[PDB]
Amino acid sequence: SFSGYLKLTDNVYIKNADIVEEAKKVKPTVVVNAANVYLKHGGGVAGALNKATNNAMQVESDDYIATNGPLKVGGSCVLSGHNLAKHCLHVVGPNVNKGEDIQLLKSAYENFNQHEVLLAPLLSAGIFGADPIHSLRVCVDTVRTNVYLAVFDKNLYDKLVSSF
Ligand SMILES: O=C(O)[C@H]1C[C@@H](O)CN1c1ncnc2[nH]ccc12
Numbered sequence: 001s002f003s004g005y006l007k008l009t010d011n012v013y014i015k016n017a018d019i020v021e022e023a024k025k026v027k028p029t030v031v032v033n034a035a036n037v038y039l040k041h042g043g044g045v046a047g048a049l050n051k052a053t054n055n056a057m058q059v060e061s062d063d064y065i066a067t068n069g070p071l072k073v074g075g076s077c078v079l080s081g082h083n084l085a086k087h088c089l090h091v092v093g094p095n096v097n098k099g100e101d102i103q104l105l106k107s108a109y110e111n112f113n114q115h116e117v118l119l120a121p122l123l124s125a126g127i128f129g130a131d132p133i134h135s136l137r138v139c140v141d142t143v144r145t146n147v148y149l150a151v152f153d154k155n156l157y158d159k160l161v162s163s164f
Pocket of ligand 1: 017018019020044045048121122125126127150151152153156
């Protein structure tokens with residue numbers, strides 16, 4: 001039920017929207033979380049998605065880490081989407097503020113190819129410190145499945161479209 005998106009390529013679409021509000025409206029099969037390896041959902045997209053689940057995402061995530069240990073940077077796991085989606089794909093992009101290899105951003109986006117359609121944010125952008133223009137380029141050159149990107153910041157959305 002996606003509406004109001006701008007088409008960038010055959011399979012990539014973009015909209016100026018809060019991914020939480022978009023998930024509540026659409027209830028997609030998969031919402032992507034901008035996760036860290038510990039699944040500690042404190043701020044940014046992860047903090048906002050978790051708060052919309054009334055902390056149920058963090059309780060589920062703590063049980064997953066207690067059983068499996070941390071994810072790899074560039075890796076992912078599929079957990080419940082709670083009241084927002086059928087599933088949440090938690091994907092770890094590199095955090096440039098922590099010195100992580102930006103080359104891992106392509107490996108992070110490759111996780112999206114296991115799902116036919118996804119609602120997602122730009123990986124490694126925002127508080128993860130990478131250039132969002134670079135993140136959008138890696139997304140369109142890596143993802144082959146249908147990805148609906150939600151960009152919260154209006155000024156960033158306008159810059160991403162104008163420079164595409
Ligand atoms: O604007 C953006 O593209 C990124 C980076 C930063 O502005 C935060 N953010 C988000 N993008 C989409 N839905 C969001 N919900 C909560 C945060 C958030």
